[PDB]
Short mmCIF file of all heavy atoms in Angstrom, two decimals:
data_model
loop_
_atom_site.label_atom_id
_atom_site.label_comp_id
_atom_site.label_asym_id
_atom_site.label_seq_id
_atom_site.Cartn_x
_atom_site.Cartn_y
_atom_site.Cartn_z
N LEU A 1 4.00 27.89 11.38
CA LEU A 1 3.81 26.51 10.92
C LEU A 1 2.55 25.91 11.52
O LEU A 1 2.24 26.19 12.65
CB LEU A 1 5.05 25.65 11.33
CG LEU A 1 6.39 26.06 10.75
CD1 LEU A 1 7.54 25.40 11.49
CD2 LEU A 1 6.42 25.73 9.24
N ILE A 2 1.91 25.09 10.71
CA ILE A 2 0.86 24.20 11.17
C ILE A 2 1.06 22.86 10.47
O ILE A 2 1.36 22.83 9.23
CB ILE A 2 -0.55 24.78 10.91
CG1 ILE A 2 -1.65 23.83 11.45
CG2 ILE A 2 -0.76 25.16 9.43
CD1 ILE A 2 -1.63 23.63 12.96
N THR A 3 0.92 21.78 11.19
CA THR A 3 1.09 20.44 10.63
C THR A 3 -0.24 19.72 10.71
O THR A 3 -0.82 19.62 11.78
CB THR A 3 2.23 19.76 11.38
OG1 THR A 3 3.43 20.49 11.20
CG2 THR A 3 2.37 18.33 10.84
N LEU A 4 -0.71 19.29 9.51
CA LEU A 4 -2.07 18.80 9.29
C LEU A 4 -2.18 17.32 8.93
O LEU A 4 -1.51 16.90 7.98
CB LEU A 4 -2.69 19.60 8.16
CG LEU A 4 -2.47 21.12 8.24
CD1 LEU A 4 -2.41 21.76 6.88
CD2 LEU A 4 -3.62 21.71 9.01
N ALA A 5 -3.04 16.55 9.58
CA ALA A 5 -3.32 15.21 9.22
C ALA A 5 -4.79 15.06 8.80
O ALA A 5 -5.69 15.31 9.58
CB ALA A 5 -3.01 14.24 10.38
N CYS A 6 -5.04 14.59 7.58
CA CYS A 6 -6.39 14.33 7.16
C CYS A 6 -6.50 13.32 6.01
O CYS A 6 -7.41 13.43 5.18
CB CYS A 6 -7.12 15.68 6.80
SG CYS A 6 -6.26 16.63 5.59
N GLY A 7 -5.60 12.34 6.03
CA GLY A 7 -5.62 11.29 5.01
C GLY A 7 -4.21 11.09 4.41
O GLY A 7 -3.21 11.54 4.95
N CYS A 8 -4.15 10.41 3.25
CA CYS A 8 -2.82 10.25 2.64
C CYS A 8 -2.24 11.62 2.31
O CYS A 8 -2.96 12.55 1.88
CB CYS A 8 -2.92 9.32 1.40
SG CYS A 8 -3.34 10.16 -0.07
N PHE A 9 -0.92 11.82 2.63
CA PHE A 9 -0.38 13.19 2.54
C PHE A 9 -0.31 13.76 1.14
O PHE A 9 -0.30 14.97 0.99
CB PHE A 9 0.92 13.42 3.39
CG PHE A 9 2.06 12.41 3.09
CD1 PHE A 9 2.47 12.24 1.76
CD2 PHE A 9 2.77 11.86 4.12
CE1 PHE A 9 3.55 11.35 1.47
CE2 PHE A 9 3.85 11.02 3.87
CZ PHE A 9 4.26 10.75 2.54
N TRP A 10 -0.23 12.93 0.11
CA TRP A 10 -0.20 13.41 -1.23
C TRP A 10 -1.58 14.08 -1.56
O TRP A 10 -1.65 15.01 -2.33
CB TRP A 10 0.12 12.27 -2.24
CG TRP A 10 1.55 11.75 -2.12
CD1 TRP A 10 1.91 10.42 -1.99
CD2 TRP A 10 2.73 12.49 -2.14
NE1 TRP A 10 3.28 10.33 -1.93
CE2 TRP A 10 3.79 11.59 -2.02
CE3 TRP A 10 3.05 13.84 -2.32
CZ2 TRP A 10 5.14 12.01 -2.02
CZ3 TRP A 10 4.40 14.24 -2.29
CH2 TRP A 10 5.39 13.31 -2.17
N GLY A 11 -2.65 13.57 -0.92
CA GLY A 11 -3.97 14.07 -1.03
C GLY A 11 -4.02 15.44 -0.34
O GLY A 11 -4.52 16.43 -0.90
N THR A 12 -3.48 15.52 0.86
CA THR A 12 -3.47 16.74 1.63
C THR A 12 -2.68 17.80 0.86
O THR A 12 -3.10 18.96 0.73
CB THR A 12 -2.92 16.58 3.02
OG1 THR A 12 -3.53 15.42 3.64
CG2 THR A 12 -3.23 17.84 3.88
N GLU A 13 -1.47 17.42 0.36
CA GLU A 13 -0.65 18.29 -0.47
C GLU A 13 -1.41 18.79 -1.70
O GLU A 13 -1.35 19.97 -2.06
CB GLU A 13 0.69 17.68 -0.86
CG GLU A 13 1.59 18.63 -1.69
CD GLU A 13 3.06 18.23 -1.71
OE1 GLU A 13 3.40 17.39 -2.54
OE2 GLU A 13 3.84 18.75 -0.87
N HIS A 14 -2.08 17.89 -2.38
CA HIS A 14 -2.80 18.29 -3.58
C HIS A 14 -3.86 19.34 -3.30
O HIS A 14 -3.99 20.31 -4.03
CB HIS A 14 -3.47 17.06 -4.27
CG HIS A 14 -4.38 17.46 -5.41
ND1 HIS A 14 -3.93 17.75 -6.66
CD2 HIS A 14 -5.74 17.62 -5.46
CE1 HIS A 14 -4.94 18.12 -7.46
NE2 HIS A 14 -6.05 18.05 -6.73
N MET A 15 -4.64 19.13 -2.20
CA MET A 15 -5.69 20.09 -1.83
C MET A 15 -5.16 21.51 -1.52
O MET A 15 -5.66 22.48 -2.05
CB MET A 15 -6.51 19.57 -0.60
CG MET A 15 -7.31 18.28 -0.84
SD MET A 15 -8.48 18.31 -2.24
CE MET A 15 -9.57 19.66 -1.86
N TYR A 16 -4.10 21.60 -0.71
CA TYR A 16 -3.57 22.92 -0.36
C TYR A 16 -2.91 23.60 -1.54
O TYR A 16 -3.04 24.81 -1.73
CB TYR A 16 -2.60 22.80 0.86
CG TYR A 16 -3.41 22.82 2.16
CD1 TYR A 16 -3.95 21.64 2.66
CD2 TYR A 16 -3.63 24.00 2.89
CE1 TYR A 16 -4.71 21.63 3.81
CE2 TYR A 16 -4.36 24.03 4.03
CZ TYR A 16 -4.92 22.82 4.50
OH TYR A 16 -5.68 22.81 5.67
N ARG A 17 -2.21 22.83 -2.39
CA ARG A 17 -1.62 23.43 -3.59
C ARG A 17 -2.64 23.84 -4.59
O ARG A 17 -2.53 24.92 -5.22
CB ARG A 17 -0.59 22.47 -4.21
CG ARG A 17 0.70 22.39 -3.38
CD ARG A 17 1.72 21.50 -4.02
NE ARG A 17 2.47 22.16 -5.10
CZ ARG A 17 3.52 23.01 -4.94
NH1 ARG A 17 3.90 23.32 -3.74
NH2 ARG A 17 4.08 23.53 -6.00
N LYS A 18 -3.70 23.00 -4.85
CA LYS A 18 -4.76 23.32 -5.82
C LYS A 18 -5.51 24.56 -5.45
O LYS A 18 -5.77 25.46 -6.29
CB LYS A 18 -5.76 22.12 -5.98
CG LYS A 18 -6.88 22.39 -7.01
CD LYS A 18 -7.82 21.20 -7.18
CE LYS A 18 -9.06 21.57 -8.02
NZ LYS A 18 -8.69 22.28 -9.26
N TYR A 19 -5.83 24.71 -4.17
CA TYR A 19 -6.75 25.79 -3.74
C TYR A 19 -6.06 26.97 -3.07
O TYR A 19 -6.59 28.10 -3.15
CB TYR A 19 -7.84 25.23 -2.92
CG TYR A 19 -8.78 24.28 -3.66
CD1 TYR A 19 -8.63 22.91 -3.48
CD2 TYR A 19 -9.76 24.72 -4.53
CE1 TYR A 19 -9.44 22.03 -4.15
CE2 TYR A 19 -10.57 23.83 -5.23
CZ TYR A 19 -10.41 22.50 -5.04
OH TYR A 19 -11.21 21.56 -5.70
N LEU A 20 -4.90 26.79 -2.47
CA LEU A 20 -4.34 27.80 -1.59
C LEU A 20 -2.88 28.14 -1.85
O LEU A 20 -2.24 28.83 -1.07
CB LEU A 20 -4.46 27.42 -0.09
CG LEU A 20 -5.92 27.38 0.41
CD1 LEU A 20 -5.95 26.83 1.84
CD2 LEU A 20 -6.53 28.81 0.34
N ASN A 21 -2.36 27.66 -2.98
CA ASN A 21 -0.91 27.81 -3.27
C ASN A 21 -0.45 29.26 -3.29
O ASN A 21 0.69 29.55 -2.84
CB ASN A 21 -0.52 27.18 -4.59
CG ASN A 21 0.93 26.78 -4.60
OD1 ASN A 21 1.43 26.15 -3.69
ND2 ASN A 21 1.66 27.16 -5.68
N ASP A 22 -1.27 30.16 -3.80
CA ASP A 22 -0.90 31.59 -3.84
C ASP A 22 -1.04 32.30 -2.51
O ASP A 22 -0.76 33.49 -2.38
CB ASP A 22 -1.78 32.33 -4.91
CG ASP A 22 -1.43 31.99 -6.31
OD1 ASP A 22 -0.46 31.15 -6.50
OD2 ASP A 22 -2.05 32.50 -7.24
N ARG A 23 -1.54 31.59 -1.47
CA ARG A 23 -1.73 32.21 -0.15
C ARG A 23 -0.88 31.58 0.97
O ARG A 23 -0.92 32.01 2.08
CB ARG A 23 -3.23 32.16 0.25
CG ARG A 23 -4.14 32.84 -0.77
CD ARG A 23 -5.56 32.94 -0.25
NE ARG A 23 -5.59 33.90 0.87
CZ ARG A 23 -6.50 33.90 1.84
NH1 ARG A 23 -7.47 32.99 1.83
NH2 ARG A 23 -6.40 34.79 2.80
N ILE A 24 -0.11 30.54 0.60
CA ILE A 24 0.81 29.96 1.57
C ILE A 24 2.25 30.11 1.10
O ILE A 24 2.49 30.37 -0.09
CB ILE A 24 0.54 28.46 1.85
CG1 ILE A 24 0.77 27.63 0.58
CG2 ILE A 24 -0.87 28.30 2.42
CD1 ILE A 24 0.66 26.08 0.85
N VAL A 25 3.18 30.03 2.01
CA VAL A 25 4.56 30.21 1.67
C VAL A 25 5.14 28.92 1.01
O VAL A 25 5.78 28.98 -0.01
CB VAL A 25 5.36 30.58 2.97
CG1 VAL A 25 6.88 30.59 2.67
CG2 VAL A 25 4.90 31.95 3.46
N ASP A 26 4.83 27.78 1.64
CA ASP A 26 5.35 26.48 1.16
C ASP A 26 4.64 25.38 1.95
O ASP A 26 3.99 25.65 2.99
CB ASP A 26 6.87 26.43 1.41
CG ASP A 26 7.60 25.37 0.55
OD1 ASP A 26 7.00 24.81 -0.41
OD2 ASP A 26 8.77 25.12 0.84
N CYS A 27 4.71 24.16 1.44
CA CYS A 27 4.21 23.00 2.15
C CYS A 27 5.05 21.77 1.83
O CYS A 27 5.61 21.72 0.69
CB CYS A 27 2.71 22.77 1.95
SG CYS A 27 2.27 22.46 0.22
N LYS A 28 5.22 20.88 2.81
CA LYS A 28 6.00 19.64 2.58
C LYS A 28 5.30 18.50 3.32
O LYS A 28 4.82 18.68 4.43
CB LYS A 28 7.41 19.80 3.16
CG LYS A 28 8.30 20.84 2.43
CD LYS A 28 8.71 20.40 1.02
CE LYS A 28 9.48 21.55 0.34
NZ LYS A 28 9.85 21.27 -1.08
#
């Protein structure tokens, strides 16, 4: 696990899902 802060979380979620979804297990 790593927990990341870099702005509104829906923004952070959108970035990781758009670019890295096939390389991560899950994000919340």
